[PDB]
């Protein structure tokens, strides 16, 4: 969860409203195992 | 004390963040009682209600954020047992003591009524003479203060006796024009360090 | 240039007037010929002012006790003091068991002789005397009636100091005391500003609110001196 600490200040002349992008990785000690199939690829037809 | 104390270092000394405090342009101020204001949060709170006798020493910290266009000053001091006064109604002549929740404000704090004496009857312009920290909006935004364990007994109860006060005084009242944001909070985030806790007992809560 | 005067030794130690205690013949007080004083050195308001310089203090005391008649005349009058402990028999009168001295020290002076010197060591059962206490001295709820033990450390109080006229009959003379006390042995600690308001109650720090003096004086203009 993020939360608002103080507040968004912002002087006169600049926009009120930001945008945060998120990134996301692992670390060193990170480790899998027992490969699979995912959900992530679907055949309903052949490919042409 | 011939009993052996706990050291729950994890579960107790941590960063505890408190509620914001709106600035505006009137703001007297506020201030807070210590060890009064974690009594009811986390793990610090509940051992804080098992156990007779409470040393622990404190860590400090205030937030409050501002812009280049944004001119103000803060003056953030501790002061070691901080006695609240009264007007008396004004004349002087009536016997009044400051209730409960003033004395004890708890989580949430309190708001002064005459900054200049700080309900103290002391001037405003000595109170650097005990550890204090400027906070300008044109350079540092923050403030850190630690302040040990100061008594004249090792171990003390941690529901009646307050050690110190917090101070938060806009001295210089924050100016800006119109159109920028009028919204400045104040947050105020604060730690325990090297707690020590002893004479388990039942549930006190005050 | 020698810091020996500013040092907090030579500034502490000398004599200031804690206490006045009468026993006048005529009156509704002390006509009994005895006086009941429960110790507290707050009434007094200049020295006060210099015991609010810090928080914790420890030291040691030594007293004078000076008597002459309120017209300031004097009369071979023998005089009793005695000092009682937290828990020892406070006296109900001049002939009371208190006054007996069997256990609790005493002094005998006259009011011919010089003024009776004791030394007081440090009494409280804790470190240091604290002057500001912030908390309370007692467990459960506190309502507004209960709101008097705000300010109030158990180890300030040391017990109740009382003197009285020698004798079973009543003497006609007027007797007016005053307590000295001279700091000595001192130990300090956490400096705090000096009280710019004036004095109102000896337990707690009360100021008037609807004047506040200013800590400093006023001028017309800014440029002007
Ligand atoms: C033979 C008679 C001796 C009389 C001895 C009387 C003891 C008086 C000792 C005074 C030393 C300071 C004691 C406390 C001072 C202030 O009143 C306390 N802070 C009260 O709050």
Request: charged share 15%.
């Amino acid at each position: 969860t993020i939360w608002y600490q103080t507040n968004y200040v912002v002087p006169i002349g600049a926009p009120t409203t930001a945008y945060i992008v998120a990134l996301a990785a692992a670390q060193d000690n990170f480790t899998m195992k027992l490969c699979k199939d995912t959900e992530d690829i679907e055949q309903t037809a052949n490919i042409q | 004390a011939v009993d052996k104390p706990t050291r729950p270092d994890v579960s107790v000394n941590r960063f505890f963040t408190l509620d914001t405090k709106s600035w505006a342009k009137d703001s007297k101020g506020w201030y807070w009682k210590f060890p009064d204001v974690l009594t009811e949060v986390g793990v610090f709170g509940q051992n804080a209600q098992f156990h007779y006798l409470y040393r622990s020493g404190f860590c400090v910290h205030v937030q409050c954020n501002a812009s280049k266009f944004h001119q103000g000053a803060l003056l953030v001091a501790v002061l070691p047992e901080y006695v609240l006064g009264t007007i008396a109604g004004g004349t002087g002549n009536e016997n009044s003591h400051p209730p409960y929740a003033t004395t004890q404000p708890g989580q949430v704090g309190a708001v002064l009524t005459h900054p200049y004496v700080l309900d103290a009857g002391i001037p405003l312009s000595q109170l650097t003479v005990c550890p204090h920290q400027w906070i300008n909006l044109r350079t540092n935004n923050c403030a850190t203060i630690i302040v040990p364990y100061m008594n004249t007994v090792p171990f003390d109860s941690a529901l009646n006796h307050c050690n110190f006060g917090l101070l938060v005084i806009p001295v210089v009242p924050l100016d800006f024009n119109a159109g920028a944001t009028s919204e400045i909070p104040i947050t105020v985030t604060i730690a325990p360090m090297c707690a020590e806790f002893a004479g388990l007992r039942q549930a006190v809560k005050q | 240039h020698s810091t020996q005067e500013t040092a907090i030794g030579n500034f502490f130690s000398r004599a200031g007037l804690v206490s006045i205690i009468t026993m006048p013949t005529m009156g509704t007080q002390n006509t009994d010929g005895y006086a009941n004083w429960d110790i507290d050195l707050m009434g007094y308001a200049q020295l006060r002012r210099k015991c609010e310089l810090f928080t914790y203090m420890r030291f040691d005391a030594e007293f004078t006790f000076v008597v002459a008649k309120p017209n300031g005349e004097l009369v071979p009058q023998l005089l009793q003091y005695m000092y009682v402990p937290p828990g020892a028999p406070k006296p109900t009168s001049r002939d009371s068991f208190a006054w007996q001295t069997a256990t609790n020290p005493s002094v005998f002076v006259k009011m011919t002789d010089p003024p009776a010197q004791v030394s007081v060591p440090f009494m409280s059962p804790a470190s240091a005397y604290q002057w500001f206490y912030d908390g309370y001295p007692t467990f459960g709820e506190h309502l507004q009636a209960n709101d008097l033990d705000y300010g109030q450390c158990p180890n300030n109080m040391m017990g109740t100091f009382s003197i009285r006229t020698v004798g079973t009959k009543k003497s006609p003379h007027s007797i007016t005391l005053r307590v000295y006390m001279r700091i000595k042995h001192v130990r300090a600690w956490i400096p705090r500003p000096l009280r710019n308001q004036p004095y109102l109650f000896k337990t707690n720090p009360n100021y008037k609110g609807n004047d506040i003096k200013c800590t400093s004086t006023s001028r017309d203009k800014i440029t002007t001196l």
